[PDB]
Amino acid sequence: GVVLFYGERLLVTYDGCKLTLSGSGQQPNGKYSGTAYLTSHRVIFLSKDAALNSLSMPFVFMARVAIKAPTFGPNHIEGFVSSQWSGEMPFKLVFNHGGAIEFGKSLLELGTRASKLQNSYKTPAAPPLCEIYACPPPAYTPFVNDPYYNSFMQPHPSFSPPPADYLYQTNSPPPYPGAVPP
8 A cells, every 4th residue: 555644645646667776885776667656745666566565755855857768769767866875876767658758747846846845844743643544535636636736747648547445644744845835
């Protein structure tokens, strides 16, 4: 399952994604196939097979994110996660069914917005009793229904249904900012 923070919105589900972590030294390094989730706050990747079952890349720790197109091959997304390990770990997201440009354009706009709040964000007070429960449907409603997200994200037919029966929410707020209405 996927556990969203309180105040986090699930925006895009992409089944059939390949994530490559290309760290050196002690940084993470491996290849993973599965589903990528684009939220207001992070990319979540769930390995479908597994040295790692789940990983989260908060926008505020991503750097130099770009939609890449090699001279002959398909569009993909590249970037880094910044500083167990320290320094700059490269990552690459490849999409099996197209929609890399649409996913990446959305990621760039979300990440730009979230990163501008990095210095001012203070995690809200959290309930001492931490709860995980079935995710409220509003947290994963199609983003086209929300003018805040619909104004800068484009749909794509390769985007997949949100896995409602696998979505949970915690009452804990996210420890980093996201792209949300002010």
